Amino acid sequence: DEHKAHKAILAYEKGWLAFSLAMLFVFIALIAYTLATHTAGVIPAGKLERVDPTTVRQEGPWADPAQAVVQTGPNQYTVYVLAFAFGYQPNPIEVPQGAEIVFKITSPDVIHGFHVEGTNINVEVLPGEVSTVRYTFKRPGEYRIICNQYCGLGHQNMFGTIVVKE
Amino acid sequence: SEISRVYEAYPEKKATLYFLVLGFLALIVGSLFGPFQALNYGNVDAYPLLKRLLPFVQSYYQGLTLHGVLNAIVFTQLFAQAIMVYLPARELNMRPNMGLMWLSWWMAFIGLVVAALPLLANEATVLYTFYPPLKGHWAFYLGASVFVLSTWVSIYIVLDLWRRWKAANPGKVTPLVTYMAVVFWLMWFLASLGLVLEAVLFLLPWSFGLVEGVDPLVARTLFWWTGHPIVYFWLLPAYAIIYTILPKQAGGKLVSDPMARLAFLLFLLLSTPVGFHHQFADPGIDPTWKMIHSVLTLFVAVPSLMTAFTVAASLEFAGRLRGGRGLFGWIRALPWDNPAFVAPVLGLLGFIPGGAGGIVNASFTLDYVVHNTAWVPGHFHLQVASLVTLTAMGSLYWLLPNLTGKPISDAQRRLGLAVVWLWFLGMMIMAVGLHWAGLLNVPRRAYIAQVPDAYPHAAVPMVFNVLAGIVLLVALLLFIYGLFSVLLSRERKPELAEAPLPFAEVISGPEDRRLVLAMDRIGFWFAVAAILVVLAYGPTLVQLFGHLNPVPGWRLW
Amino acid sequence: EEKPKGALAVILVLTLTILVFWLGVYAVFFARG
Ligand code: HAS
Numbered sequence: 185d186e187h188k189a190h191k192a193i194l195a196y197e198k199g200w201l202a203f204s205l206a207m208l209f210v211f212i213a214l215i216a217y218t219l220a221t222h223t224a225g226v227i228p229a230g231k232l233e234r235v236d237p238t239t240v241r242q243e244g245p246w247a248d249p250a251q252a253v254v255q256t257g258p259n260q261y262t263v264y265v266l267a268f269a270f271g272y273q274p275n276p277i278e279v280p281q282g283a284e285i286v287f288k289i290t291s292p293d294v295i296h297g298f299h300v301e302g303t304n305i306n307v308e309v310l311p312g313e314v315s316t317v318r319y320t321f322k323r324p325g326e327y328r329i330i331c332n333q334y335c336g337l338g339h340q341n342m343f344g345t346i347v348v349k350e
Numbered sequence: 351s352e353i354s355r356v357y358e359a360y361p362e363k364k365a366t367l368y369f370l371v372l373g374f375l376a377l378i379v380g381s382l383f384g385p386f387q388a389l390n391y392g393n394v395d396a397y398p399l400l401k402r403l404l405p406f407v408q409s410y411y412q413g414l415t416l417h418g419v420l421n422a423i424v425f426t427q428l429f430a431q432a433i434m435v436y437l438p439a440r441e442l443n444m445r446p447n448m449g450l451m452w453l454s455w456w457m458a459f460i461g462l463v464v465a466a467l468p469l470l471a472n473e474a475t476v477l478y479t480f481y482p483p484l485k486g487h488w489a490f491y492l493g494a495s496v497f498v499l500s501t502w503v504s505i506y507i508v509l510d511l512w513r514r515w516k517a518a519n520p521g522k523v524t525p526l527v528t529y530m531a532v533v534f535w536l537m538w539f540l541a542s543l544g545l546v547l548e549a550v551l552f553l554l555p556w557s558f559g560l561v562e563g564v565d566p567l568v569a570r571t572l573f574w575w576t577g578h579p580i581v582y583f584w585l586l587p588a589y590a591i592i593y594t595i596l597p598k599q600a601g602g603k604l605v606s607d608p609m610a611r612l613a614f615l616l617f618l619l620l621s622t623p624v625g626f627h628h629q630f631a632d633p634g635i636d637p638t639w640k641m642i643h644s645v646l647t648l649f650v651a652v653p654s655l656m657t658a659f660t661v662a663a664s665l666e667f668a669g670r671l672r673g674g675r676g677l678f679g680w681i682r683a684l685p686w687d688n689p690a691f692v693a694p695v696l697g698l699l700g701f702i703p704g705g706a707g708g709i710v711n712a713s714f715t716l717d718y719v720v721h722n723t724a725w726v727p728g729h730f731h732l733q734v735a736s737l738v739t740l741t742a743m744g745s746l747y748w749l750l751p752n753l754t755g756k757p758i759s760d761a762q763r764r765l766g767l768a769v770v771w772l773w774f775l776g777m778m779i780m781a782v783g784l785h786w787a788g789l790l791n792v793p794r795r796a797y798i799a800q801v802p803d804a805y806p807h808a809a810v811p812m813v814f815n816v817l818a819g820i821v822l823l824v825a826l827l828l829f830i831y832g833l834f835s836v837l838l839s840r841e842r843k844p845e846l847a848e849a850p851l852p853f854a855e856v857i858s859g860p861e862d863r864r865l866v867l868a869m870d871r872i873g874f875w876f877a878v879a880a881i882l883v884v885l886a887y888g889p890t891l892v893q894l895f896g897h898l899n900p901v902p903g904w905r906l907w
Numbered sequence: 908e909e910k911p912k913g914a915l916a917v918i919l920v921l922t923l924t925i926l927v928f929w930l931g932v933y934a935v936f937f938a939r940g
């Protein structure tokens with residue numbers, strides 16, 4: 185008693201540890217899996233792409249909202265989005281379902297979130313940097329963009345729209 | 351000029367009390383905003399009423415800043431400074447350097463006041479994460495800096511206690527509580543460098559006018575270097591108490607000294623090099639490095655997995671000694687009549703759903719589902735707002751008397767149980783509401799009650815948030831009532847202020863020795879922990895600092 | 908006395924809860940891919 189319980193516990197402890205680590209490694213495998221699939225496109229680009237937040241809507245790919253969407257591949261469309269103090273440009277964003285949409289988002293003021301309700305697109309938008317994420321819509325419709333990073337008093341009203349054409 | 355002979359003999363007792371009281375006052379003020387934040391997520395807008403009561407409040411966001419800052423940063427740090435200095439002191443029966451101890455209290459107090467001014471004045475509504483380009487008043491950054499640096503003095507105090515004890519006990523293994531405290535503070539020192547670097551290199555010169563811009567990516571990369579380990583900084587004081595005091599309150603013993611040392615050692619090693627799990631959705635950070643940090647994060651979960659079994663086993667053991675029946679008999683044998691026992695046990699119950707949430711958030715690609723949604727706040731109220739806070743509240747039943755000599759009537763003990771059950775119950779209901787809403791894409795840090803029709807599909811979970819807000823409001827009110835009924839009475843049995851701390855006995859075995867001896871090579875393990883931080887952050891930080899792109903600040907409130 | 912049935916029970920619940928959360932969100936991840 186007490187010294188008997190000591191050995192037992194310490195014994196099942198080692199078992200519990202071996203099991204736990206095993207379950208963790210399985211998770212590590214299932215995560216590796218996702219990184220090999222098409223779903224891993226939502227992982228922000230790793231390379232640094234600097235830009236000036238004070239001249240973003242004056243000169244460059246984000247200057248003219250009309251040239252936001254641009255076919256860069258047979259089925260690839262690059263959308264230059266601009267998340268700003270309480271809104272998204274262009275609004276709405278119009279793209280074709282089934283095509284690989286490569287978003288390149290930046291901000292002219294503070295940090296914003298870019299969360300496309302219904303998808304895995306969830307990337308932070310930083311002033312002076314370009315957030316590059318790839319995604320392929322498989323269902324047409326109006327997907328709503330929600331800002332999930334506090335950016336000021338109008339933050340709760342910062343929404344955007346993406347129209348994937350059938 | 352000391353009316354208490356007890357305080358002359360044990361001065362650390364007085365400094366500890368000042369840390370505690372300052373900490374709970376902060377907890378009370380910050381918590382006032384909670385119920386309103388819950389109603390808000392319940393789609394109900396009660397702010398005009400709060401605005402009528404607390405006129406200085408200008409918005410949902412200023413209140414959220416006060417909430418996070420006063421609760422997650424101030425209350426938790428002061429509780430840690432009080433516990434991780436006093437417990438090791440009483441265990442070793444050695445006096446901390448008192449000139450330094452009081453100096454650390456004044457730094458925290460002066461730093462808190464200095465920062466509180468701008469906060470209360472709506473000059474820094476940037477949330478407890480204060481992410482640039484959002485620019486707050488210089489007194490906010492200066493106040494926080496001093497407040498946090500208070501901990502560096504705390505670190506020095508305990509290392510000093512430790513060195514002095516080792517000199518008077520040559521060849522003896524560091525006692526358990528002191529061991530936890532030492533690796534705890536050494537971990538914090540390594541962890542705090544991120545924030546110190548952010549404040550010294552960017553934040554402070556930025557708010558003082560020396561520089562006009564700050565690179566957002568490196569600012570948040572440095573922030574999270576400290577950002578994650580700080581929640582372990584919030585947790586371990588609770589863990590020290592759960593491992594070394596709870597078993598005694600339960601009527602049992604800690605079934606393994608070596609296991610508790612190992613858990614804490616793992617924390618010293620793996621707490622800091624995992625910050626990228628707070629940056630999965632960030633650009634400019636290599637995906638491979640994110641995977642690596644994702645892996646080191648799953649490993650940091652190991653210590654808590656061990657803690658779960660060691661503590662559970664100690665509780666079962668205690669339950670048996672009390673006449674524990676079968677597979678669940680030990681559970682009913684425990685002292686559910688003692689709040690010092692119940693508060694932390696409930697905290698551990700909700701910690702299960704809490705840790706599961708964390709493990710999810712830590713799986714790299716899976717974070718894209720819940721990042722910045724109500725799910726995250728759902729996760730952490732189960733961790734810090736419940737486990738840490740309940741353990742702290744519950745420990746008031748043995749700690750408050752031990753420091754003041756003030757007894758606790760049976761009425762206060764029962765009021766305490768009601769407060770504990772409600773807080774726990776309330777937090778659980780809210781966890782369900784926030785997690786549910788999070789899966790429904792409702793964002794966090796949002797005054798959504800102001801846009802009623804923005805989230806219709808979150809109909810039922812909003813109800814749970816309204817219920818939680820009411821339940822917790824009642825619990826909070828009762829806590830205040832009871833806390834002050836204890837600090838405002840004059841009954842004083844000096845003999846109980848002189849009683850020893852209710853430390854639990856520890857069962858030891860034969861194999862302990864050599865394992866315990868290896869873990870006591872603190873200098874070695876410290877260097878190892880430091881090397882991991884250099885390997886997990888060095889490569890990325892070198893590249894960010896070679897391509898800094900600072901941007902202008904903004905005020906959008 | 909003997910085997911820690913209660914402790915094992917607790918970590919069993921901890922284990923199952925972790926699986927529901929993980930597998931549950933791992934599913935949603937793909938549903939939104
Ligand atoms: C004290 C406070 C906190 C603790 C502890 C904590 C632990 C974890 N967290 Fe976390 N966390 C994340 C991952 C984890 C992981 C893997 C763990 C682990 O350390 C947890 C391990 C826990 C376990 C494996 C459970 C063990 C269970 C035990 C020990 C209880 C057993 C019960 C017993 C013994 C009683 C039985 C009683 C009877 C009567 C039978 C991630 C992602 O990787 C994010 C980013 C999310 C995002 O996208 O923004 C995150 C975000 C946060 C934020 C938001 C910060 C912000 O504002 O942006 C906060 C405040 C926070 C706090 C805390 N977090 N976390």
Ligand code: HEM
Nearest residue numbers: 384385387388418421422477478727734735794795796822
């Ligand atoms: C009366 C109990 C409490 C209630 C009802 C409550 C409620 C809430 C709610 C509804 C939110 C979400 C706010 C939003 O996303 O806009 C929140 C956030 C938060 N809470 Fe609490 N809370 C309580 C106690 C605590 C305690 C005790 C702590 C820490 C020790 C804490 C720390 C935090 C933190 C750090 C945040 C995040 C702030 C941010 O995102 O900037 N809360 N709380």
Ligand SMILES: CCCCCCCCCO[C@@H]1O[C@H](CO)[C@@H](O)[C@H](O)[C@H]1O
Nearest residue numbers: 352364368448449452453455456457460
């Ligand atoms: C900015 C540096 C400030 C250094 C301040 C050093 C103060 C020295 C200690 O003062 C302490 O004050 C407590 C009340 O607060 C008294 O109860 C305690 O007996 C007294 O010793």
Ligand code: CUA
Nearest residue numbers: 331333335339
């Ligand atoms: Cu933009 Cu919140």
Ligand SMILES: [Cu+2]
Nearest residue numbers: 577578627628
């Ligand atoms: Cu973390």
